[PDB]
Design a protein around this ligand. Sequence first.
Ligand SMILES: NC(=O)c1ccc[n+]([C@@H]2O[C@H](COP(=O)([O-])OP(=O)(O)OC[C@H]3O[C@@H](n4cnc5c(N)ncnc54)[C@H](O)[C@@H]3O)[C@@H](O)[C@H]2O)c1
Ligand SMILES: NC(=O)c1ccc[n+]([C@@H]2O[C@H](COP(=O)([O-])OP(=O)(O)OC[C@H]3O[C@@H](n4cnc5c(N)ncnc54)[C@H](O)[C@@H]3O)[C@@H](O)[C@H]2O)c1
Ligand SMILES: NC(=O)c1ccc[n+]([C@@H]2O[C@H](COP(=O)([O-])OP(=O)(O)OC[C@H]3O[C@@H](n4cnc5c(N)ncnc54)[C@H](O)[C@@H]3O)[C@@H](O)[C@H]2O)c1
Ligand SMILES: NC(=O)c1ccc[n+]([C@@H]2O[C@H](COP(=O)([O-])OP(=O)(O)OC[C@H]3O[C@@H](n4cnc5c(N)ncnc54)[C@H](O)[C@@H]3O)[C@@H](O)[C@H]2O)c1
Ligand SMILES: Nc1ncnc2c1ncn2[C@@H]1O[C@H](COP(=O)(O)OP(=O)(O)O)[C@@H](O)[C@H]1O
Ligand SMILES: Nc1ncnc2c1ncn2[C@@H]1O[C@H](COP(=O)(O)OP(=O)(O)O)[C@@H](O)[C@H]1O
Ligand code: NA
Ligand code: NA
Ligand code: NA
Ligand code: NA
Lengths: 252, 251, 252, 251
Amino acid sequence: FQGRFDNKVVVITGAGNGMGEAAARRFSAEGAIVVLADWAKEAVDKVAASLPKGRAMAVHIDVSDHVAVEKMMNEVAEKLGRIDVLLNNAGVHVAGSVLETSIDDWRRIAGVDIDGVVFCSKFALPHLLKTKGCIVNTASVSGLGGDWGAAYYCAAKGAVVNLTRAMALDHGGDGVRINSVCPSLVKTNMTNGWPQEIRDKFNERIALGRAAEPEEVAAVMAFLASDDASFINGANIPVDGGATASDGAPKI
Amino acid sequence: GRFDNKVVVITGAGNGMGEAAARRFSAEGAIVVLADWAKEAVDKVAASLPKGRAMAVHIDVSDHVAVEKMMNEVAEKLGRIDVLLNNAGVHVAGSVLETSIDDWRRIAGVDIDGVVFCSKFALPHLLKTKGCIVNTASVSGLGGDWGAAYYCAAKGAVVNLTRAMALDHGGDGVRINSVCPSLVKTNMTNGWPQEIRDKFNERIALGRAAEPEEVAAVMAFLASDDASFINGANIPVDGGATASDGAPKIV
Amino acid sequence: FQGRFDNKVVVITGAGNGMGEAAARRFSAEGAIVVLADWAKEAVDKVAASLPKGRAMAVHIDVSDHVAVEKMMNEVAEKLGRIDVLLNNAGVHVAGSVLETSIDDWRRIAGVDIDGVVFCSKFALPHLLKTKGCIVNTASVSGLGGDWGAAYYCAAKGAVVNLTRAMALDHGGDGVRINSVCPSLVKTNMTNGWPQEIRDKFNERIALGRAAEPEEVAAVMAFLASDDASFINGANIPVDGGATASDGAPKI
Amino acid sequence: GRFDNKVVVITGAGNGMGEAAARRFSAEGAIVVLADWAKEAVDKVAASLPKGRAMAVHIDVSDHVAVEKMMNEVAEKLGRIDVLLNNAGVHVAGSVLETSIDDWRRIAGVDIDGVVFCSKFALPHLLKTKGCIVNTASVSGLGGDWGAAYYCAAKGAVVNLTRAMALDHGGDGVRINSVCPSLVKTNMTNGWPQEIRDKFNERIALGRAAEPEEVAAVMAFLASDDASFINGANIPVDGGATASDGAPKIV
Ligand SMILES: NC(=O)c1ccc[n+]([C@@H]2O[C@H](COP(=O)([O-])OP(=O)(O)OC[C@H]3O[C@@H](n4cnc5c(N)ncnc54)[C@H](O)[C@@H]3O)[C@@H](O)[C@H]2O)c1
Ligand SMILES: NC(=O)c1ccc[n+]([C@@H]2O[C@H](COP(=O)([O-])OP(=O)(O)OC[C@H]3O[C@@H](n4cnc5c(N)ncnc54)[C@H](O)[C@@H]3O)[C@@H](O)[C@H]2O)c1
Ligand SMILES: NC(=O)c1ccc[n+]([C@@H]2O[C@H](COP(=O)([O-])OP(=O)(O)OC[C@H]3O[C@@H](n4cnc5c(N)ncnc54)[C@H](O)[C@@H]3O)[C@@H](O)[C@H]2O)c1
Ligand SMILES: NC(=O)c1ccc[n+]([C@@H]2O[C@H](COP(=O)([O-])OP(=O)(O)OC[C@H]3O[C@@H](n4cnc5c(N)ncnc54)[C@H](O)[C@@H]3O)[C@@H](O)[C@H]2O)c1
Ligand SMILES: Nc1ncnc2c1ncn2[C@@H]1O[C@H](COP(=O)(O)OP(=O)(O)O)[C@@H](O)[C@H]1O
Ligand SMILES: Nc1ncnc2c1ncn2[C@@H]1O[C@H](COP(=O)(O)OP(=O)(O)O)[C@@H](O)[C@H]1O
Ligand code: NA
Ligand code: NA
Ligand code: NA
Ligand code: NA
């Protein structure tokens, strides 16, 4: 894998979260120039400073802001001369049915989880078309099926999963492949803090019996951006240890 | 009499599948609330149905303030809501590169926000009647199209919102399902060229576009007691469109 | 619904099981001439004798036997002059992973659950084409997704679900619609005998919080055979109270 | 060295995607067992690979007695099995009305029974290595075709067997997944007329048939440590074929 992404420019939104950092490190190890784009400063600055000098840069972005996103994509292309890979990894979650969640909760979910993927993809694509680059969306198993108690989140991830399909049809023939990863439970500080009773309920539904490490999702992002994935287009790859392979029946 | 004295709220009721649903539910005894932003069109449909059993509301379903008011006024005036058909929708053709931010806001406002808001504000009333929701999604929410990116994102949202809300509310006696039509003979597609429409007859195994009555028929079924164990389903009404793996005919 | 299937000939395989009997009664109530086809005699004889005289007949069939199935379909067509509806409702289940289940278990699952649908559909179709009739397959949620501990059964029901699609493409344009119902847990003597701990685990996965009555599955079969389903072709309708609408995550 | 000294059993290894997998796994350090009923073809592939690191088995995978023997002999002789590629397959074109009971038995024997039997008899060995299975399914197992009914039933079985076995064995450290190609340039499709093949370039967004190496690449990925959290997945390698809702292009 040494040199798989040598001198490729990889723009990573939501670069300051577990999967974002793992993606930045994996692509960086394989020779990429990473742009770590996030709202928050501290996390992406710390990651960028850990990576080879001149091969990583941190930016502030609100992915829900189309004017800011267009500017970021054009400045990155101007400064680095190219964009090869977009990882749409920004995310917000809010828990609840539509009865437990507000219009504001909807706007927060929709702005980042839907509008961010639409805007970053639309404004990166002209650059990707020049390099025959690709997009990898961070969707979710929550976009392939429903959850109890995350209605707006499921709507937004459902939008990303089907937008991945539609855009793959629109652009794949012009040499830009568009795919998603659909993770389940990812080991984070939030999941490390869960009681055993909660964590055991999740592990029972996943045949592999554990949460994904963020490196395990990053690995699939790197594969989907690689020449080995040359015939994978419009795919929403479950990275879920078997979660969505079930018909919903309990394990007996 | 399948829907005798059931209150049925139908968005996009002034034309096409909404109008066809209004007539079908009305014929089966429903009191029908016809919601549309096309005022002349929805007034004409309302006036065509039996007196005292149909009322028109001039509303943009993208507007949460207008939607909350409609749902509460309907519930107050008629005493109940039994069925919501989230049918109002608009289409725009093109990739994200050929369609504007404004095109996105129009698609998202009607096709996603409308469904979210109407569902949210009807649900407290549906819980009292053990009522149901039927969303008009599309095959374009079960898979992608060439040249309708924003529309596909919006319909994808409707398909998975259908699933999530069914898990949330099915246990409290409110079933939530969708219909997913392919080509239907309506104002939405009557501008589409013969080249495109003829290819649908190749991609749809039944070899024709659907009549709007044929989707209305499935909406009525999904709201009926015969659908008592169907929940969170996105029912293709597509003559076989989504049954295909995408391959052209092998022979 | 009085007269919806007036004088239509409805051939029901596996007519002696819960869903079969419920289908026979529902179609019979709506005016159909029912042929109740099953291996076993007592159950279908009792149902046929309960239904209007001259409007129900019981037959013995092994649906896994192509020679016997061709003969049954041609004799029914000759005797009644027509076939309008085929309900492929025969089934066997065997529990276990491929490590816990034998070659014989595979042959038993495959013969009835796959070969029966292939053979009955192939030999009924010439008759269905004359009436512009339809097929409704009894598939399962176990054909739309996997189970723990029913590997062969899941393979066979997966075959029925995709054969439903393929045959719908082949025949829908010649006026024979082909669809399936995909039930979850159906209330039977087997499920009535389950301990509360087992039944509670099933009910938790189903948003409606209960097993389907066989009448509730029969209702969907009758709909799929009706003129109201004129544009439904190649569909595998979940009749599962929400079971397959889940992404597999536990309810919290 | 990704597969250094891993034993990889490949059915249908004498041609097409099987042969391409044998060469790819061999280049990455695997010892490759090439199983095929085409004896000259699989012997030529085996003889092309590094001495001591490839062996041919002349076997009909539809035969459970032959398959159990192969799996146990391979395990005894090489001490282990790390990867099974259930790739052997045959195609027949036609509806059930145009294809015979014998056509069915041939399709089912190879395309279903072969996968069931090879999986069943390799699994005890894979459990010892925390190995994996990659099934060659098809888009024709994720949806239907016009004119390949028996093939679609068989591939549908492979797709859902992949899911069920992943739930059964994933917890014991054996991942089970499939690749689902659309049109690939192999002996299976080289007889298909230009009319049909040209329409695939329309239905596949990438606008071409796959090279067999492009599916072999995904087989190697699914057997690799990078796929450590992918289990029960049916991965489309189809240039977009199944991403479509079936509709022809909208513009
Ligand atoms: N016609 C097709 O081929 C097809 C296929 C799949 C799904 N659909 C869906 O069917 C639904 C109905 O559309 P149709 O085909 O019957 O078209 P139509 O144009 O006949 O009817 C749509 C109706 O919705 C109304 N409407 C639009 N936006 C609205 C808003 N913001 N507030 C209130 N009313 C609004 C329109 O005025 C119109 O009366 C839509 O959701 C559409 O996406 C259409
Ligand atoms: N902000 C809003 O309130 C808003 C926004 C958009 C449109 N609308 C309403 O939508 C309605 C339609 O106006 P429009 O500007 O969209 O026109 P339009 O673009 O819909 O033109 C007429 C449409 O209906 C079809 N049509 C034409 N003659 C018809 C007939 N006799 N019967 C049925 N269908 C016919 C046409 O093919 C076309 O689809 C108006 O009532 C308008 O006020 C509301
Ligand atoms: N080529 C395509 O377009 C395509 C698309 C989707 C999936 N597939 C699947 O790919 C797999 C490989 O086929 P291919 O396209 O590389 O074709 P191929 O003809 O190049 O190779 C298939 C190989 O399987 C062998 N084989 C067949 N039946 C066998 C049996 N009973 N026992 C042992 N070996 C047997 C053949 O001799 C041949 O060497 C099959 O499962 C096929 O269904 C093919
Ligand atoms: N019962 C069995 O053991 C059984 C059953 C069927 C076939 N087979 C074996 O399958 C093999 C193929 O024989 P067949 O009768 O299927 O022939 P065939 O029908 O496969 O004819 C040759 C096939 O390979 C292709 N081909 C032709 N020349 C080629 C070349 N130089 N390189 C690569 N591919 C080429 C052709 O396009 C065609 O697909 C034989 O070894 C046969 O014994 C085994
Ligand atoms: N509007 C936004 N613009 C850019 N990045 C954002 C925006 N909203 C959230 N992000 C970033 O996306 C990443 C993923 O968010 P989230 O999933 O909430 O984080 P976590 O995985 O830490 O819970 C975070 O690093 C977050 O700061
Ligand atoms: N080979 C066969 N030919 C015809 N009918 C069969 C065959 N095998 C089983 N059946 C019938 O199919 C029906 C469904 O079988 P099964 O699901 O095992 O029954 P149950 O629902 O009572 O458990 C039964 O009435 C059974 O007798
Ligand atoms: Na995960
Ligand atoms: Na129009
Ligand atoms: Na059920
Ligand atoms: Na050939």
